UniProtKB/TrEMBL annotation, chain A:
Gene Ontology biological process terms from the UniProt entry: translation
InterPro entries linked to this entry: Ribosomal_eS21, Ribosomal_eS21_CS, Ribosomal_eS21_sf
Sample GO molecular function, one term: structural constituent of ribosome
GO cellular component assignments: cytosolic ribosome; ribonucleoprotein complex; rough endoplasmic reticulum
Protein name from the UniProt record: Small ribosomal subunit protein eS21
From TrEMBL, chain D:
Keyword Glycosyltransferase among UniProt keywords: no
Entry protein name: 40S ribosomal protein SA
GO molecular function: structural constituent of ribosome
GO biological process: translation
RNA sequence: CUCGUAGUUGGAUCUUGGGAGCGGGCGGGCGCGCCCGUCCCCGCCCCUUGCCUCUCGGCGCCCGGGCCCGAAGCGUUUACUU
């Protein structure tokens, strides 16, 4: 960040990926910060709030992205079902 | 007041003596004759058990905890009656054997067997506070930077005995050892 | 590790983490000490003494029933053996190997096992030298090959 | 997803889920599908989790509705086994369809005719759309896909656990996904069962 | 023989880390690598962790986090004469803004800043980032 | 990232695994509290007895050691965990 | 291609173990006290981790003695850091 005296460490905050607790670089393409609609849960209808998911780009090739966003959604509490 | 109801091994003589009077009243019956006449505690110190309560701890001279439980089972089941509202369980009294590798003296014997160190005595402490239910696991957890927690797992078919006494163990362990332990009951194969 | 064998497999044991007393047939310390003394008395080896004590009585560890173990309590009795297990078993297979070679001299690739035999007994001999269950000098040049062999 | 048991498990799904054959995927398994199974036969096939199926399917609906303005998302195959389904899903949804034949570079080549700017990629199957899936990894647009026990699962962000081989199961999936997505949109307030029946999405050699 | 469970920890964690698993299990352990775990925590690179008890080796499960790059193990085991400390800082670890070389010496475990603060040096075994 | 619960993963995996790599390594052996049929007493053996214990009730043998196990010809009471 | 002397090396563990410990030095809510900080860092400590046993005596402190001292740290040892 920009500290008070100028301990300048960030020129800005790059989009951090939380799906694996890892940071990415400037030039990526699979680090996708998709949006997800929030429900009202009086009918299950969409309403105006965001559940977001931005995974580090490289994991998509391994095809873990489905699993990681499964974990993310379960934790986020828009998905509660568990067998 | 301590003939063979309390063999003498230390300085104070206060509550263990009344406990011993209870013991000599117990040993009149057909399950404690000459079995509660010999393995009688020597010291006893008052501490808490959980919140809103208190209890008494018994220090045997402790050459005995091998064959001590074979009367301590009857001792709990038939002296929790006459000192109810508190708890009793056998302990291994160790002052401590101090560290061998620090030495300048001669009246401190020259080689240490492990059974007197800080760690072996500590597993002896865990045995002490739960004899009848065996330990079936120990996962050690770290608190907030390096502080200690010890999850310890016990036999499923041995909960029938110490479940209203579930916090009592970790209550005593805090003074005896110094850290926080919990006792869960896992899946069995 | 693992020089003297090219295979790496291990299947030895992993005793129950629960150091508790076995408790299937308890068969407490008295008859256990009697059987341990009997087994050592009649001329048996700790490796098979333990096998018998696990078979008939049933033991996972003698240290569990009694703090002193077989070697310890024999050493406190007086029944220490001639030579220990690792020197003796390799000696009594060496006798067979050398019998083989000098009966079929052409077996050029069993001299390659004889040599590892003097090597294994040599390693364990200079080990048991410091263990001091053997004299400060203990000489095997295949001159000790049959001194104990009748 | 959701804590509404009405969107969640109901007989309204199973009465057709068991009818199609939604509780069987295929013989073998890739190492990225274990999340979505509960039992195994003695007969050589794995019977998928339809509950987890509806779970990630409702997450799929969540993604489809987070499309703030529908004109800008592609639903694609190139295999006729789902060409009809994608056509009739896009026709009623509004987001654009591509099926049958694709052209690499449409949303990858900077200069292109039919240079289309999607914002989400829907594919019938990764084994069915080789190149478009790679191009979806090329441009920053998320990927939604069906998933079998057999199927390779690479670059899949939104997974729908079900067999995708068969017209009957895949038609059930499109036909109930449409209702689910519009449900969470809120145009369907649990007023009706939807009058379209799954024979509509079981692919046809059209002679009618 | 099998050797240097410290080195084997610093290789197994980096084996699993670039593969991204949230926690990790390592077969062997020691009180001293436990002590590295704790020094790591005081900076927060790792989270809390569990010490699975099997008297045979002692296994460790520890969480990996995006707070880390790697930590090295140095056999042979040197000594920092407190002249060479700045040298080792400037030539091993990538940053003076994080990461601080590790020392076992006569004042407890420590990393190099806290070592310099107590004015006592010793062996290098670790350096992290 | 296909990370499994490492403080406590699923049970069956540990049993199906080799005993020597377990979360805590415990044997694949049990103990045999058998009858040795044909007599009114009950006696026990090591459940993989590589040295036989004679079955003098039916006038036969009790334990044929077969590989990494002791297989019984005539013997009644198999007993599971006791410790 | 095997063995093997020196050859350089090496499992785990034999305290990184508790207190509200105190004065003092601190990160910190509070205004170094309560404290979160495995005794946050030591003189004084407390469960332990070494010694006055020996002379005359230092504020002690009791009644030539003794809990600590001294000239001084004499009950294994080395490596290595200040």
């Amino acid at each position: 960040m920009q500290s008070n005296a100028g301990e300048f460490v960030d020129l800005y905050v790059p989009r951090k990926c939380s799906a694996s607790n890892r940071i990415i670089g400037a030039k990526d393409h699979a680090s996708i910060p998709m949006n997800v609609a929030e429900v009202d849960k009086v009918t299950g209808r969409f309403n105006g709030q965001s559940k977001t998911y931005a995974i580090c780009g490289a994991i998509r090739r391994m095809g873990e992205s489905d699993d990681s966003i499964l974990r993310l959604a379960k934790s986020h509490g828009i998905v509660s079902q568990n067998f | 007041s301590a003939k063979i109801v309390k063999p003498n091994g230390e300085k104070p003589d206060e509550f263990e003596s009344g406990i011993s009077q209870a013991l000599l009243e117990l040993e009149m019956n057909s399950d404690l004759k000459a079995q509660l006449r010999e393995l009688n505690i020597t010291a006893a110190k008052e501490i808490e058990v959980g919140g809103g309560r208190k209890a008494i701890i018994i220090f045997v001279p402790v050459p005995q905890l091998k064959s001590f439980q074979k009367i301590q089972v009857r001792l709990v089941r038939e002296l929790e009656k006459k000192f109810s509202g508190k708890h009793v369980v056998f302990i291994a009294q160790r002052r401590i054997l101090p560290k061998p590798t620090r030495k300048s003296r001669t009246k401190n014997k020259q080689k240490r067997p492990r059974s007197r160190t800080l760690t072996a005595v500590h597993d002896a402490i865990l045995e002490d506070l739960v004899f009848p239910s065996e330990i079936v696991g120990k996962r050690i957890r770290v608190k907030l930077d390096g502080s200690r927690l010890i999850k310890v797992h016990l036999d499923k078919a041995q909960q029938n005995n110490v479940e209203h006494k579930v916090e009592t163990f970790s209550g005593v362990y805090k003074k005896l050892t110094g850290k926080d332990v919990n006792f869960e009951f896992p899946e069995f194969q | 590790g693992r020089m003297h064998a090219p295979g790496k497999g291990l299947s030895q044991s992993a005793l129950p983490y629960r150091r508790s007393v076995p408790t299937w047939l308890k068969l407490t310390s008295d008859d256990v000490k009697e059987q341990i003394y009997k087994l050592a008395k009649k001329g048996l080896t700790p490796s098979q003494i333990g096998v018998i004590l696990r078979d008939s009585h049933g033991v996972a560890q003698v240290r569990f029933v009694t703090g002193n173990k077989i070697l310890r309590i024999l050493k406190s009795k007086g029944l220490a053996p001639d030579l220990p297990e690792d020197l003796y078993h390799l000696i009594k297979k060496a006798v067979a190997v050398r019998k083989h070679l000098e009966r079929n001299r052409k077996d050029k690739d069993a001299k390659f096992r004889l040599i590892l035999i003097e090597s294994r007994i040599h390693r364990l001999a200079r080990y048991y030298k410091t263990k001091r269950v053997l004299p400060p000098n203990w000489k095997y040049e295949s001159s000790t090959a049959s001194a104990l062999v009748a | 997803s959701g804590a509404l048991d009405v969107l969640q498990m109901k007989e309204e799904d199973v009465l057709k889920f068991l009818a199609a054959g939604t509780h069987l995927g295929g013989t073998n398994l890739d190492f990225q599908m274990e999340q979505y199974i509960y039992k195994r036969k003695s007969d050589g096939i794995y019977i998928i989790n339809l509950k987890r199926t509806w779970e990630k399917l409702l997450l799929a609906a969540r993604a489809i509705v987070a499309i703030e303005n529908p004109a800008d998302v592609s639903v694609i195959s190139s295999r006729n086994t789902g060409q009809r389904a994608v056509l009739k899903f896009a026709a009623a949804t509004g987001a654009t369809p591509i099926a049958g034949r694709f052209t690499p570079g449409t949303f990858t080549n900077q200069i292109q005719t039919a240079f289309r700017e999607p914002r989400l990629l829907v594919v019938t199957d990764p084994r069915a759309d080789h190149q478009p899936l790679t191009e979806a990894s090329y441009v920053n647009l998320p990927t939604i896909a069906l998933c079998n026990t057999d199927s390779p699962l690479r670059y899949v962000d939104i997974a729908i656990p079900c067999n995708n081989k068969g017209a009957h199961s895949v038609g059930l999936m499109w036909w109930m996904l449409a209702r689910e997505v519009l449900r969470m949109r809120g145009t369907i307030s649990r007023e009706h069962p939807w009058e379209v029946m799954p024979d509509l999405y079981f692919y046809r050699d059209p002679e009618e | 023989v099998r050797m240097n469970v410290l080195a084997d920890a610093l290789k197994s964690i980096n084996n699993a880390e670039k593969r991204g698993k949230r926690q990790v299990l390592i077969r062997p352990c020691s009180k001293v690598i436990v002590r590295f775990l704790t020094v790591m925590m005081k900076h927060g690179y790792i989270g809390e962790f569990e010490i699975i008890d099997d008297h045979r080796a002692g296994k460790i499960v520890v969480n990996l986090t995006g707070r880390l790059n790697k930590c090295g193990v140095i056999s042979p085991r040197f000594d920092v004469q407190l002249k060479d400390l700045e040298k080792w800082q400037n030539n091993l670890l990538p940053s003076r803004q994080f990461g601080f070389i590790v020392l076992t010496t006569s004042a407890g475990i420590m990393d190099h800043e806290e070592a310099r603060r107590k004015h006592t040096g010793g062996k290098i075994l670790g350096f992290f980032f | 990232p296909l990370a499994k619960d490492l403080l406590h993963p699923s049970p069956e995996e540990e049993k199906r695994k080799h005993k020597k790599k377990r979360l805590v390594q415990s044997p694949n052996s049990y103990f045999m509290d058998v009858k040795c049929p044909g007599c009114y007493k009950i006696t026990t053996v090591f459940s993989h007895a590589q040295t036989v214990v004679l079955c003098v009730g039916c006038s036969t043998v009790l334990c044929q050691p077969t590989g990494g196990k002791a297989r019984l010809t005539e013997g009644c009471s198999f007993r599971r965990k006791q410790h």
